[PDB]
């Protein structure tokens, strides 16, 4: 039993090592459970940034839509043409497995 507890204490020590340093003693990356948590945290940060940008983008887009409604003949901002929209729908179709 003492030998078996010797074997278990090393695993506890490494699992608690993972809380300060990325590498795991001998020099390998942490790869289980904790790694997924770190990946989730990174994804949450990026999603925060993207939503923050999207809000102001919508704020501008609504005003342009109102301007177009009031007066026809205003030139698209070159991002509203057919080519950019076609690229956008192509990306949406590709990423989500054909819609």
């Amino acid at each position: 039993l003492t030998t078996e507890q010797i074997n278990m204490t090393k695993e506890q020590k490494e699992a608690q090592r993972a809380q300060t340093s990325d590498t795991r003693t001998d020099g390998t990356r942490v790869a289980g459970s904790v790694g997924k948590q770190k990946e989730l945290y990174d994804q949450q940060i990026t999603s925060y940034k993207r939503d923050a940008e999207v809000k102001a983008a919508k704020l501008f887009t609504d005003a342009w839509v109102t301007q177009k409604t009031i007066d026809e003949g205003l030139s698209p901002p070159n991002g509203f043409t057919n080519s950019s929209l076609d690229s956008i729908l192509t990306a949406l179709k590709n990423n989500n497995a054909l819609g």
Partner: protein, 197 residues
Amino acid sequence: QGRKLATRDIKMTWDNRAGITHWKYANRHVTTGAEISSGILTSPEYVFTLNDQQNAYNGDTLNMSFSVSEYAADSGAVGASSSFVGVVQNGSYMQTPTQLKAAKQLNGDIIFTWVGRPSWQHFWVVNTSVNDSKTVIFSKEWSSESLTWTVAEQNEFYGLEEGGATHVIFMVSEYDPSNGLVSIGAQVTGQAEQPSN
């Protein structure tokens, strides 16, 4: 040597010894020593876009601290590094054109007109393709305030024979013949203006 382009980006130029093909660079914050970005680049120029300036600083800057060293691909080697910490060549004393318009014509030509200071009649004009936004054709200086771009669109650039290009991307800025400094400038983007009747 630092250069703030018209598009508000910052670019630097390095003399080439022709014996080495790769270089390494390091870019840092100004107030603190935090490193914004680093890596290896295979060309003697680096462009620090305004999006990166807005990501690092809340606003565009006129200050930079840059360090570059020449690097060997076969064996990881970093030599001595040259550091530049002063302001960029700036160019803000000249003003910028106020209002710019692009109008289509029944002939098919496009007329670009802008209002400039009477004292400064030297201007630099840049045009870019709508398909790629990087082709940067038609770059030169014009003293005349009004420009007639005629039918270059139909020939040798767009496969269209008679239609021409409805959308334009134009950018004009004051130019200094001696120093070469360029002001911020103004841009137009869209469908331009369809002609009456």
